[PDB]
Amino acid sequence: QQALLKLIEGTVASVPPQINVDTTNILFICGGAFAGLEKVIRQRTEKGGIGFGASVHADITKLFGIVEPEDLIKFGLIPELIGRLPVIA
Amino acid sequence: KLPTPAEIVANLNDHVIGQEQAKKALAVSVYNHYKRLRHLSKSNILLIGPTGSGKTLLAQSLARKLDVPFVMADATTLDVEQIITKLLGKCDFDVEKAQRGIVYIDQIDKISEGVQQALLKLIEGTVASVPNVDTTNILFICGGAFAGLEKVIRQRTGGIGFGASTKLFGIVEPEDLIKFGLIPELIGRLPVIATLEILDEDALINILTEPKNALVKQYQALFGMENVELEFEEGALRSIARQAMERKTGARGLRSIVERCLLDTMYRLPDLKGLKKVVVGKAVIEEGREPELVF
Amino acid sequence: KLPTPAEIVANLNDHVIGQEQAKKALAVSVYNHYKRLRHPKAGANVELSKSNILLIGPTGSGKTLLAQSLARKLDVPFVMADATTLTEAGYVGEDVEQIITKLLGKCDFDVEKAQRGIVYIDQIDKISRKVSGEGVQQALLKLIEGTVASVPPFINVDTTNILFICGGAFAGLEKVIIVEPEDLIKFGLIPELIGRLPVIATLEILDEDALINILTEPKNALVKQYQALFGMENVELEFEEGALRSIARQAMERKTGARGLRSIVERCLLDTMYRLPDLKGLKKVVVGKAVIEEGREPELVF
Amino acid sequence: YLVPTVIEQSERAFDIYSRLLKERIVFLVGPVTDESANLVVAQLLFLESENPDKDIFFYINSPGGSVTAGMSIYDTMNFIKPDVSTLCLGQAASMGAFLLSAGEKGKRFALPNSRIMIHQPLISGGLGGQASDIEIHARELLKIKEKLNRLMAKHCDRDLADLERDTDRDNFMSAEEAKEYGLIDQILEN
Amino acid sequence: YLVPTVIEQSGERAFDIYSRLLKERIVFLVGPVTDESANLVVAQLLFLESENPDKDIFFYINSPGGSVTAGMSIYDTMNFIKPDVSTLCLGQAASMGAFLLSAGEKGKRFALPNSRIMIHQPLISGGLGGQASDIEIHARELLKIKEKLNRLMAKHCDRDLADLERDTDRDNFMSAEEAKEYGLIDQILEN
Numbered sequence A: 001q002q003a004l005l006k007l008i009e010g011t012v013a014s015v016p017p018q019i020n021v022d023t024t025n026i027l028f029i030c031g032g033a034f035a036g037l038e039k040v041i042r043q044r045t046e047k048g049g050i051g052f053g054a055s056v057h058a059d060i061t062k063l064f065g066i067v068e069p070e071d072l073i074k075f076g077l078i079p080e081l082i083g084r085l086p087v088i089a
Numbered sequence B: 001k002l003p004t005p006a007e008i009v010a011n012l013n014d015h016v017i018g019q020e021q022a023k024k025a026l027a028v029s030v031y032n033h034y035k036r037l038r039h040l041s042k043s044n045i046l047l048i049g050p051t052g053s054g055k056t057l058l059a060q061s062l063a064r065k066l067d068v069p070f071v072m073a074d075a076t077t078l079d080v081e082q083i084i085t086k087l088l089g090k091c092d093f094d095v096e097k098a099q100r101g102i103v104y105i106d107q108i109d110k111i112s113e114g115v116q117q118a119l120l121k122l123i124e125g126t127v128a129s130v131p132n133v134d135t136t137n138i139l140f141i142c143g144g145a146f147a148g149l150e151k152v153i154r155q156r157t158g159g160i161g162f163g164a165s166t167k168l169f170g171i172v173e174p175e176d177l178i179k180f181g182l183i184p185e186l187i188g189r190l191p192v193i194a195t196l197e198i199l200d201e202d203a204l205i206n207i208l209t210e211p212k213n214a215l216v217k218q219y220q221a222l223f224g225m226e227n228v229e230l231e232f233e234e235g236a237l238r239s240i241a242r243q244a245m246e247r248k249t250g251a252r253g254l255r256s257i258v259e260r261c262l263l264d265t266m267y268r269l270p271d272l273k274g275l276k277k278v279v280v281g282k283a284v285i286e287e288g289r290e291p292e293l294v295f
Numbered sequence C: 001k002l003p004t005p006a007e008i009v010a011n012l013n014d015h016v017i018g019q020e021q022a023k024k025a026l027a028v029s030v031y032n033h034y035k036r037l038r039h040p041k042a043g044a045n046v047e048l049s050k051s052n053i054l055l056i057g058p059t060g061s062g063k064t065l066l067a068q069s070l071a072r073k074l075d076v077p078f079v080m081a082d083a084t085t086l087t088e089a090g091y092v093g094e095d096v097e098q099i100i101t102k103l104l105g106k107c108d109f110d111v112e113k114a115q116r117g118i119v120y121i122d123q124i125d126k127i128s129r130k131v132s133g134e135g136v137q138q139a140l141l142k143l144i145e146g147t148v149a150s151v152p153p154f155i156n157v158d159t160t161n162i163l164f165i166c167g168g169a170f171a172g173l174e175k176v177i178i179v180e181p182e183d184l185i186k187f188g189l190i191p192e193l194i195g196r197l198p199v200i201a202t203l204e205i206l207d208e209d210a211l212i213n214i215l216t217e218p219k220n221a222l223v224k225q226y227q228a229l230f231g232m233e234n235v236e237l238e239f240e241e242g243a244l245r246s247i248a249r250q251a252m253e254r255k256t257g258a259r260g261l262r263s264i265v266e267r268c269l270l271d272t273m274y275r276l277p278d279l280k281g282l283k284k285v286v287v288g289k290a291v292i293e294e295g296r297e298p299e300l301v302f
Numbered sequence D: 001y002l003v004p005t006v007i008e009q010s011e012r013a014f015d016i017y018s019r020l021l022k023e024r025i026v027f028l029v030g031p032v033t034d035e036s037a038n039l040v041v042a043q044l045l046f047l048e049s050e051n052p053d054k055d056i057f058f059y060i061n062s063p064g065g066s067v068t069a070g071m072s073i074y075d076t077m078n079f080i081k082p083d084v085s086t087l088c089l090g091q092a093a094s095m096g097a098f099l100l101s102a103g104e105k106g107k108r109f110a111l112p113n114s115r116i117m118i119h120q121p122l123i124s125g126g127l128g129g130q131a132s133d134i135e136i137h138a139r140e141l142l143k144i145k146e147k148l149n150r151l152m153a154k155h156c157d158r159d160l161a162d163l164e165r166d167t168d169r170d171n172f173m174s175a176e177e178a179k180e181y182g183l184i185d186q187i188l189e190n
Numbered sequence E: 001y002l003v004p005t006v007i008e009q010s011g012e013r014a015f016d017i018y019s020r021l022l023k024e025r026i027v028f029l030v031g032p033v034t035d036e037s038a039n040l041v042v043a044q045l046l047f048l049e050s051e052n053p054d055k056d057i058f059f060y061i062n063s064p065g066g067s068v069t070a071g072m073s074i075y076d077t078m079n080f081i082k083p084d085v086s087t088l089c090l091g092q093a094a095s096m097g098a099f100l101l102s103a104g105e106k107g108k109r110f111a112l113p114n115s116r117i118m119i120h121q122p123l124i125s126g127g128l129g130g131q132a133s134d135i136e137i138h139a140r141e142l143l144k145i146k147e148k149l150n151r152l153m154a155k156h157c158d159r160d161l162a163d164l165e166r167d168t169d170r171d172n173f174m175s176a177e178e179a180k181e182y183g184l185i186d187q188i189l190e191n
């Protein structure tokens, strides 16, 4: 993750020949199955408890549909990488 | 010359909204640092406050005002000497400026021992060697979202049983930072403690429309790369200000929301023809509503 | 040559006001421990073993400051260890050999200086019997006395000649009790570690008068520091005796002690440092009793 | 009675009532006495400390009891910052109905088949001794009677004259009648 | 009764809810004042002084009265120990309960709005049987106690002894406001 930060933002890569490559204008699409993310989101958003009016309990589509950078930080990606991936689909 | 603390805050005001107490505390600590260098210990500063309160900008704005190079650092990316590599790059490796520059270290509250000791290696004057910089005279600005520090203080100052309990951050002592998990030795080099309050929903409108890099201006440019004008209703700016505040991200949450509310039109915008203006009403920020499309 | 114990104490006097009995114990032990190192090592000459110190005193009494003020006088490598970061060999945490790794790093791997340095180990009171407790004491036994540590940059470091100052806020020891091994054993230390720390030095708890002397007497005293900052602007900084008494009382009543003396001074002077360079014609700034105690502003004397 | 033990995952073993206190549920079961009232007060004070902002849920299944004991609960409920929601289980009679009506307006509940009964106080203490002593105790009882009707009328948004009529003799109400009267705000079903 | 258990965050420590409140310097006097209930209050007052001689102790009173000698053990302990003992009336403070309420540190005697405070001359401090000589002795001791209590009450309330002698003749019930005007308490809490 740390190694990628300079690649996700602009740097100059040095790679073998057939070369200095400016990475400023390269677009990155990252993704994965954040399997434990639904648990992180429920821990943050689902106010369950015991008694009358307590929420009682998964709707994984709804949970992923409300993912926020805070959840990805708790999941395990470094804030410096998350802050350079502003669009979450 | 060296601008006086009054002159330094006078221009910190042009970049940082609110946080008046943090600005004068910083204006004095920076003055003493650079007045000392024109001449017995030094004094670095710690910034305590919420996410989105402007800690980073305040550190950046200062470096610009003092005509010194600025490097961004993060306590949770620990290797520490590569911050000096960056600081040197900012001044074309002229160590005379790097050795008098400013280092901002974010997320100090998240390393609350090995990393803290590495940070102390640079803060206590040493010589970094990168592809030789004496760090003795570098001013360090550290900070973080010490949310649990509120509990450290509440533990000591109403009380359980007929009792109600930056009000408490204003009385942070080195002992509270130690109880929070920071090493006393690292704290001993950061004697000045300043606090930053969370911005309210009016301050976030100025974030949206006043700065040179304001979000509204950014997205007006995007629509302006076509023959289309983009305009935001006051209500739209108020509802987005609250939405960002309600995530407790302050200024940070504004970007995600502007992108969210406009994307449903930005993907149509290249096909729409005859369009002259797109107006973002508060309805667009709040619901699955289309902006006014003026043809 | 060496400084005599009297010269070591004189240096300690310029940094620590108070704790006289420990100053003697530390000054004599170091003087002897660096006379042992300088003793010829040949033939029938008796081999001189070392005397380590267990430094017992309240939190904030100056244990570390004595250890550092002392090391700076000898020009020896010096590190501070925290006994609560340590763990048993097979567990996550720091090894006792990380103490040597630090001591060696401080001298750029020059083992001829690391092996003659001083180590202060804090928080001994926190590794008592009542992987994180007794296991750490047992691991330290063979580090305090002679062993050859395998130290990565592997470097073979003989710790026989390292002087260890170990200490902690043994508050439960006043209750158990003039400390004797019987009290330390009941506290929760193992006899094997107690017997390796033959010299016990003790520190007094700071009172209000000590706090006042801390404000004004030491070489790096707070009042002197700020007088220099005001001196940069050609302005004299004066404290009334009531102000110093008020600072000390606040630091005491707020239960922070010496650690909080900087906070109080910085707060009361902030509204003058902010204006000071613009207040031309100003000659003196007076911090009175009311300025420290009440919601009052410093007096500007033109 | 044997109070079951339950395990909280975090493990911590609780008796089931301490486990429910962890969820901010305080029970008032059976007669209101100095001892049972002081436990409610201790729990209310404790919960305010744990979180001054979160609601406290005060479950009431009580035939009544001492007025002074009930008033220690009542004043604690009103004093502490967090709203105290009240729920009637089985019955809330006499001071139990008073404490039910004393819950935060909008958060007073009853279960569908619960029984709520309001009435003027009985003896707050015996009336023996001399006619002078009996006069004093009769006057104190009348002051309490007026105080309870006045506070009830405030809780229910009714006139003092209405509570004086309606508390003359034991006035039994269904949850629906208590809702219409103004003792509770809602009736729970699911 | 089952006394709930609560967890204190520090590691964790499990307390019964009254031991948890004692940790906050809250001492309860609930129900009749007896040798046993009075000695627990004394033990708690002594303990809290040792923990911190300077911090206030909060003495919550919900009591109909009880033994005078038992109440006096509390009273003398309250006055002896260095920390101020603040007193609060919950539900009621009657007889020795009202005495101990008024005995709190001046300026720190509280009552809740609907609490009931009752002051009166003592009843039997012990039976009066035996011979007329024994009855004379016990009658004299009861009168000395009566005078002592009125004198200490008058001191607490900043009133004349003559006022307390009138007002304690028969059970004198007071609202929190009347107790404040009388001088038994200093303030009435609301929120």
Ligand SMILES: Nc1ncnc2c1ncn2[C@@H]1O[C@H](COP(=O)(O)OP(=O)(O)O)[C@@H](O)[C@H]1O
Binding pocket: B015, B016, B017, B018, B019, B050, B051, B052, B053, B054, B055, B056, B057, B199, B207, B211, B250, B251, B252
């Ligand atoms: N008090 C403030 N005044 C002006 N801008 C602010 C303030 N707080 C946050 N911002 C804005 O937040 C944006 C992102 O900066 P960021 O690094 O997230 O700040 P922070 O250090 O609060 O996280 C910047 O464009 C900055 O203008």
Ligand SMILES: Nc1ncnc2c1ncn2[C@@H]1O[C@H](COP(=O)(O)OP(=O)(O)O)[C@@H](O)[C@H]1O
Binding pocket: C015, C016, C017, C018, C058, C059, C060, C061, C062, C063, C064, C065, C066, C214, C218, C258, C259
């Ligand atoms: N006698 C003294 N003279 C000057 N400063 C002191 C003295 N005693 C304590 N201090 C201050 O206390 C701070 C912490 O000292 P230290 O000895 O490390 O406390 P502890 O031993 O409890 O960790 C130091 O920064 C020092 O300035």
